[model samples]
Target: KEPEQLRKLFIGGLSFETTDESLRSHFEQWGTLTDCVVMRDPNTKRSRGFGFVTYATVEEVDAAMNARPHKVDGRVVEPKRAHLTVKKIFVGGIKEDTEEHHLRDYFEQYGKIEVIEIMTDRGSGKKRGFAFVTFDDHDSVDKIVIQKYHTVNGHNCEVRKAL
Candidate 1:
C-alpha cells in the first residue's frame, strides 16, 4: 500500500440492525480491506452500529462506493442513494391533492410507474406542494425526461434522482 496507507474513514449513520461480517464481506469484495470494526458496548458487546472501515488501498474504497449498494440485514447500504437505482421526476403544476393513483396515472403516459410520493409533512401529515414520480427503470427515466421534463405540468419541475 502507498499514499499514506490509504488513510482511515468513519462510517456512521449505519443501521444498528446491520451486521459486522456482512459489512466486512461487502468491502472485501471491493478490494483489500485493512480492518473493519462495528462499535459495541464494552460490557455487553452488543452492536452500536456506527463503526470504522479502513481500506489498504484508496482505489479499493473508491471501488467499494461503486459496488451498486445492497440491503444489509434489512437496512439499505446506500453509499450513494441519489446516484444509484432508477431516477424519479418531480411533478408540479398540479394540485396538492394529487394522490398516488392519479400521479401514477399521469406518469404512466411516459412509462410504467413504480412509485410516487407526495413529500408530506411529518407533523401535520399533509402534502408539501410537490411530489416524486419514479419509473420502472433507467430507460423510462430518460424517456420521460426527454419527452416532458421541462415541458410538462405547465412548469419545469425538477427531476430528483432516487432509488
Candidate 2:
C-alpha cells in the first residue's frame, strides 16, 4: 500500500484493561479518526497489550506524534508516526575517514541517490562508520543486494536493505 493510506499508528505497552473506547477517546482529539482498534486475545478476550490508531490523514498522525510521552490509564504513553517503505539501503563498516562524496561515487552506478546520511558521533563529530543511501527506484535494490560486501577506502562495507 502507498505509505499515506497506511496512516495507522501502532500503540504498545497498554494496560490489560485498555479498551477500544479508551484508545479512540485519547486519540480522537488529534484529528478525524478513520479507524481505531485495540488488539485482544481470542481466547482470553483480554487486551493483547497493544493496539493501532488510524487517522483520516497523514497530518493527523504527525500531530498525534508531537503530543506523545504522556500517561494513559495510570501508565505512561509514547506515540510515533508509522514508518514509510522507501527504496533505501544501509551501508555500514565504512572507514571513519571516508567522505560522503566518495560514498556517492561508489554507489551511483546502481541508481540516482536521493539522500545519503552518514552516521556520526554526536560529540566527536566524526563519522560513525555507517551510512544510509536512498535510491530513487526500488528496483535498484536488486542490483545492490547482489554485492553483499564492498570495499570503500580500504574498508569492507556491509550493505543491507534498510529494514
Candidate 3:
C-alpha cells in the first residue's frame, strides 16, 4: 500500500498574506484535499511563507505536480513531494556502466520503485558509479538494507538508506 507521505506535498514560496483557507482553495482546483496548513510562528503567529497540503490520493499529487507553475496569493509557489522519512536508498560500488533499468530490474523484486536515478557527471554525462532508488513503501528500503549486499550486472554493490 502506498503511504500517506506519497500523497502529501510541500508548498514553498508562499506569500506572507496566504492563509490555510487560501492554500486549500488554491490546491482544490486539482483534487480533494485531505489536510492543508500554513505554518506560522508560535509567538508572532505570522505566516512562515510555507506549508503542507495533503491530497486524497497519490494520483491527485501527480495531477498537482503536472499542472505546475502553481501561483498563489500573487506569488509563484513551488510544490514538491514531501518526504516525512527516508524512502530513497543510495546504491554505491556499482559499475559505471550499470544502467537505470539494471537497478530497476534488480530492486523491483523487493517492492515497487517510484524512481531510479543513476548519477552522472554533468560535463561528461557518464555514470558516476552510484545511483539513488526511491520506493513506494519504506519497508522496501528496510528489506534492502537488511540484506546489506546487492549485485547488479554481475557486480557487487552497496545499498544504504538515503539521507
Candidate 4:
C-alpha cells in the first residue's frame, strides 16, 4: 500500500535543474524518506519542476512542512500536505493569440502544470477569452490565487479556483 496523504508532501516551485538525488538529500534531513521523486516529462525526460516526498511517518511530514523557506537548488521551494489530487484554476482575460505554452511557461513558475485548456468557440474556432490551468498540486492554486492577477503575453488575466 502507498503512504497516506498525511505522510506525503507535495513539493512545489522546484528548480527545473533540481534532480531526484538532490530532492531526497534535501528532505531526508527532517526524517526518513520512504519515497522521493522529481516528476518528469515522459518523452523529454525533463524535470516537471515539482515532486513528491514520502516520509516514514506523519510526524516527519509535519517537520518538513514546518521547516519553512525550504530551498532546493538555490530556489525557495514550497512543501505542503500532498492532496494527491489535481486542481484547476480559471484564467480569464487571456489574449486571443495566447497559446498553451504561453500559459504553461508563465504558470510553471508557481507549480507543475498538469494540463492547460484554452476555451474556444465551436463554430468560429476563436478563443473564448478564458482558459483552465490544471496543476498537479492543489497548493499551487492557493499560490496563484494569493496574487489573483497575472500578466500573460501582455494581457492582464484573472485567476480563480475552478468551480
Candidate 5:
C-alpha cells in the first residue's frame, strides 16, 4: 500500500441505509477526505452497511480511528480493522430467485451471509447466470476462498470479492 493510502480508513457499524454524505460528515471531524465510497447491493441498490473513507493522508485515518465511534442518526460508526469491504469470493452454481433467505441458509451453514442476490433479467425475469455474495463477518470470508468453488443448476458460478 502507498504511504499516502496507508491511512485509508474503513468505516463500519453501518445499517444498510447509511449514505456517502452521512459518512463523510462523520469523518470530517478528523481531517480532509480524498474519497468516500459506500458499498451497496447492486440489485437492490441498498447500502452495504459499511463504507470506505480515503483520506489525503494516513494521518487522517489515524485521527478518525483515535476519535473512536461516532453517532449518526442514533447509529454508531467505527472502523472495520479487518474486512475492508472487498474480499475474494466464490462463484459457480448460482441460482436465480435467490434473494436473501436462500443465501443466508446455504452460506450460514458455513457462516453468516451479509448479503446475496442473483442476477435476473428485468424483462424476462430469467436468471442472469451470475450472483453477488458477501459474508456478514470478514473472518468467514477467508475460509470460503480456501474451500472449493463450484457451479450449479447448469449455470457456471463465479465468486469473487468486489473491487
Candidate 6:
C-alpha cells in the first residue's frame, strides 16, 4: 500500500558550483531517488543553490530527514518535506536599524510568530530592509492583511504572503 505520497524534499544551501550528477550521487545514499534537480539561472546557466529530490518511499524520506545538518559539496543544506505546510509572510521596507525583536514585536500583536528571517547584506552584514515572517496558523496571515498595520521601527513597511 502507498502509505502516503512520494516523499519530495526541498534541498537548499547548495553550492553554486554543484552539478546534477553530483547532487544525485549525494542523495542516493538515503534511497532510490526518482529525480534530483539543481535549479539554475537560465541566462547564466549557473546553479541557483537550491534543488528538489524525490524518493521512492516514506522510509527513505524519513532516513533523509533523520540526517540532520545534511551537507553536500562541503556546504550544509536545508532539507524539509516539500509541502505547503506553513504560512509565511513577506515584509518589506524594513528600516536599516530594524532588529529581530523589533520585527517580532510589530507582528506579535497579530499572532504568534513561529520564525522570523530578516535578510542581511553578505559583505556589509547589514539588514536588507525586508524580512520573512512565518506563523503556525493561516489566520495569522489574514490578521496581518485585515488589520493591516505595516510599520517597523517607524519606517513604513510592505506586507504580503511569501510567494
TM-score, each model?
Answer: 0.41, 0.51, 0.55, 0.50, 0.46, 0.49
- Residue 10, candidate 4: alpha-carbon lDDT: 82
**Top candidate when judged by TM-score against the true structure:** 3
Question: Alpha carbon lDDT of residue 118, candidate 1?
Answer: 82
Q: How many backbone clashes does candidate 2 have?
A: 0
Task: Point out the worst 10-residue segment of candidate 2 by lDDT.
Answer: 77-86
Off by over 4 Å in 1: 3-7, 68-70, 78-163
User: What C-alpha RMSD separates each model from the true structure?
Assistant: 11.3, 11.1, 8.4, 12.7, 13.3, 12.8
Which ten residues in a row are the worst by lDDT in model 4?
78-87
Which regions of candidate 2 are displaced past 4 Å? 1-5, 83-163
Cα lDDT of all candidates, in order?
0.60, 0.76, 0.85, 0.83, 0.63, 0.79
Give the runs in model 5 whose Cα sits over 4 Å from its true position: 1-4, 81-163
lDDT of 6 by residue, 28-90 (tens): 999998888899999999889999888888678767766667879989987766444447888
Ranking of all predicted structures according to lDDT, beginning with the best and ending with the worst: 3, 4, 6, 2, 5, 1
lDDT string for model 3 (2-110, tens) is 5777778889899999999999999999988989999999999999999999998877876787677888999999777753356799999886878988999999987
**lDDT leader:** 3
Candidate 4, residues 1-163: lDDT per residue as tens digits? Answer: 4346657888889999989899999999999998899999999999998999999986676577657679898999978774433388899999698999889989998777888999999999999999999987666675577563699989999988895
- Model 3 is weakest, by summed lDDT over 10 consecutive residues, at 139-148
| Cα distance off (Å), candidate 3, residue 154 | 13
**What is candidate 5's lDDT per residue for 1-163, written digit by digit as tens?**
4354465766767866678887788778899988888999899988878788888765565566556667855688767432434542545456654444555565665455666766678999897656667765553454454334543444444555554
Position 15, candidate 3: lDDT? 98
TM-score: the better of candidates 4 and 6? 4
For candidate 6, what is the lDDT? 0.79
How many residue pairs of model 1 clash at the backbone? 0
